[PDB]
């Protein structure tokens, strides 16, 4: 009769560095074989030091983001402090699990600076399980995006390679290049890439353009 879920597409990537956290997403919202809009960013700025990326059913994403924003205000009033990136991750795991019987269809990657100031990337399954990872990719193109990050940021399967700490310039170049490659082979990924960089000074958003085909 009626199906409660739809796949709106989209891919989200988060990369963590010693002084920076990069959360990036495509701007294409799609239903079936059609594009609803080419300007929907899937990256949302939860706090000064944190950004969340959401991909999956759009209705769940909008509901989850509004609930997370509301919960952040409630915590700030009670604890008189902003929620930390790790605390946001633990709260999100509980909220996602609360709907275990009727799951929120969203893949969430939380990227932000930690209390020490190092970049933290936390990746969540739809039901709620989360793990801290140096780099993670989510959404329709997660399968295409991740192996390149493992090879380049990870230096996996590479011998006689100097391991050099990731730099913002290299990380930006990698985020843009993996997304152009995904646009070539993913129908739901394309139009534009929004890159939000979390640094001690603040969060800065940059937009690059992917294929409109």
């Amino acid at each position: 009769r009626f199906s409660p879920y739809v796949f709106n597409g989209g891919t989200i990537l988060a990369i963590a560095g010693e002084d920076f956290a990069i959360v990036a997403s495509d701007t294409r919202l799609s239903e079936g074989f059609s594009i609803h809009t080419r300007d929907s960013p899937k990256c949302y700025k939860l706090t000064d030091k944190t950004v969340i990326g959401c991909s999956g059913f759009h209705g769940d994403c909008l509901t989850l983001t509004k609930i997370i924003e509301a919960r952040l205000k409630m915590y700030k009033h009670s604890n008189n402090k902003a929620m930390t990136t790790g605390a946001i991750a633990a709260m999100l795991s509980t909220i996602l699990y609360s709907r275990r019987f009727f799951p929120y269809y969203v893949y969430n990657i939380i990227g932000g600076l930690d209390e020490e100031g190092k970049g933290a990337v936390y990746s969540f399954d739809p039901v709620g399980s989360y793990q801290r990872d140096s780099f993670k990719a989510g959404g329709s193109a997660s399968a295409m995006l991740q192996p390149l990050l493992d090879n380049q940021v990870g230096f996996k399967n590479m011998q006689n390679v100097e391991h050099v700490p990731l730099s913002l310039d290299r990380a930006m170049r990698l985020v843009k290049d993996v997304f152009i490659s995904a646009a070539e082979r993913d129908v739901y990924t394309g139009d534009a890439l929004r890159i939000c960089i979390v640094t001690k000074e603040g969060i800065r958003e940059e937009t690059v353009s992917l294929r409109k085909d």
Partner: protein, 221 residues
């Protein structure tokens, strides 16, 4: 897949996108969906790709044998009757949606053939996932007896609407212009979208990959 065709004053213009998709992944970025049925007749193919290639190739071979026997240029109706009759017996199991356009002694003719074997002869036809998007361009801007250049522009716009507004269609626009005196197969007629430059070059160096065993067998030339 967006495949479309129009009949201009002196002939037929047939257009198609070059994107073949397996699941949601793009399998091919340069697929020729316009096939040769005969020197004067060409068919645009949408639906299961293997079914479309085989259906056009069998009909093209049958027309070639028929043309050698007749000693005359093939007529488009013969291709439509052969294509419709073959598709009907398969009962829609062979999923080939085909736009067949050609110019014969009788004149310029365009037909749309469906997998169940239904055929419609029309001035302009669109087939595939982006067919509705292409039809909207054709309804909005189609005039009978259009000139060849105007026809090429309109069919390209219809194919482009499918590429941009349909996830299934994409990559490039290929146009075949068929007229009594001239046939032009233009591939790619236009390249609407291209991949961005690679900002950082991985350039994996020699010795990066560890090899457990190596065997070199010389081949004499």
């Amino acid at each position: 897949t967006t495949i479309a065709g129009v009949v201009y004053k002196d002939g037929i213009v047939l257009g198609a996108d070059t994107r073949a998709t397996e699941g949601m992944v793009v399998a091919d970025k340069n697929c020729s969906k316009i096939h040769f049925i005969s020197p004067n007749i060409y068919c645009c193919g949408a639906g299961t790709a293997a079914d479309t290639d085989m259906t056009t190739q069998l009909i093209s071979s049958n027309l070639e044998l028929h043309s050698l026997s007749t000693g005359r240029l093939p007529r488009v109706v013969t291709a439509n009757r052969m294509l419709k009759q073959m598709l009907f017996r398969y009962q829609g199991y062979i999923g080939a949606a085909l736009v067949l356009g050609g110019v014969d002694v009788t004149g310029p003719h365009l037909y749309s053939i469906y997998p169940h074997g239904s055929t419609d002869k029309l001035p302009y036809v669109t087939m595939g996932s982006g067919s509705l998007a292409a039809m909207a361009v054709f309804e909005d801007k189609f005039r009978p007896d259009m000139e060849e250049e105007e026809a090429k522009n309109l069919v390209s716009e219809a194919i482009a609407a499918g590429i941009f507004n349909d996830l299934g269609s994409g990559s490039n626009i290929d146009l075949c212009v068929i007229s009594k005196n001239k046939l032009d197969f233009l591939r790619p007629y236009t390249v609407p979208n291209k991949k961005g430059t690679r900002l950082g070059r991985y350039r994996c160096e020699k010795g990066t990959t560890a090899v457990l065993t190596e065997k070199i067998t010389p081949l004499e030339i």
